[PDB]
Structure 1
Amino acid sequence: EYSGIIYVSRLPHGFHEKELSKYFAQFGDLKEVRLARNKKTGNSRHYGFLEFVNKEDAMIAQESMNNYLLMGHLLQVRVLPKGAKIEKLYKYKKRVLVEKGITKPVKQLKDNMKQKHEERIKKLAKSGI
């Protein structure tokens, strides 16, 4: 048979886990909600998973909102078979950068570049030009 887990796709912008939960909790009491996001500058990958309690709230939600058309992306939602046990899509945040350095005294890198000049020259020699 099927699970109690439901899967949604083709969500619009600005429709994140908060509003997903707030809306779908109008069909019962939900266990968990997870949405897909990015690793760097987390933005919505436009799908996610939910699961309330009963094996019938899932079918009610699907039958109700399978081809539902809100802001101009018509939604899609499927019921899952026994298990499949949603596992991932931890919620990320925008990746602020921090300068890692500088630590090494400029002299060994100066030797590095004084070598790299002729290193490039030999690379283009064998290429060869």
Structure 2
Amino acid sequence: KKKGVLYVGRLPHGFYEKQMRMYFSQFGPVLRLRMSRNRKTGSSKHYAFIEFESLDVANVVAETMHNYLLYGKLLQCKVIPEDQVHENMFKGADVPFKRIPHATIARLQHADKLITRHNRKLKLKKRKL
């Protein structure tokens, strides 16, 4: 019934959304999982939030996956308080990850108004000088 949000911490590199969802679905259905990722680069912030179908299963996975030594990291599995569970708790959850190739986007992006702005900037630099 109550839709238990079981968090996972100390996630080894590679234990990403696909691997977590597959592993944690084995214990119980993982409705939504959104592994935290950086806004710029989408590097796994190394913690995720699993909304197990039942609070019971989330609690069961908590006890069995807490202090779990996975590749040198003691997985911190503590069921997220349902009262503290937010609405933006799972905003855009389970999405194919979209770190735009900003570096290329700015790079492909590379007239008279720009020249005027440069002249104004030069005038501002002269004023500062």
Q: 1:82 to 1:110 in 2, by over 3 A?
A: closer
Distance 1:44 1:111 in 2: 43
CA-atom RMSD, angstroms? Answer: 2.4
Residue ranges of structure 1 left out of the alignment (5+ in a row): 125-129
- Confirm or deny: 8 A CA contact 1:3 1:81 kept in the other structure: no
Letter in 1 for 2:79: V
Distance 1:118 1:55 in 2: 65
Matches within 5 A, 1:1-129: 4-83=4-83, 84-85=85-86, 86-88=89-91, 90=93, 91=95, 92-96=97-101, 97-98=104-105, 99-100=108-109, 104=111, 106=112, 108-124=113-129
Name the TM-score, length of structure 2 as normaliser. Answer: 0.75
Q: May I ask how many residue pairs the two structures share in their alignment? A: 119
Q: 1:8 to 1:122 in 2, by over 3 A?
A: same
- Confirm or deny: 8 A CA contact 2:3 2:53 kept in the other structure: no
Q: Report the structure, 1 or 2, having the larger strand content.
A: 1
Q: 1:115 to 1:29 in 2, by over 3 A?
A: closer
Residue ranges of structure 2 left out of the alignment (5+ in a row): none
Percentage of matched positions with identical amino acids: 39
Distance 2:53 2:3 in 1: 10
Distance 1:76 1:70 in 2: 11
Q: 1:33 to 1:109 in 2, by over 3 A?
A: closer
Q: 1:66 to 1:89 in 2, by over 3 A?
A: farther
Name the TM-score, length of structure 1 as normaliser. Answer: 0.75
- Confirm or deny: 8 A CA contact 2:17 2:34 kept in the other structure: yes
Mark the structure with the bigger radius of gyration.
1
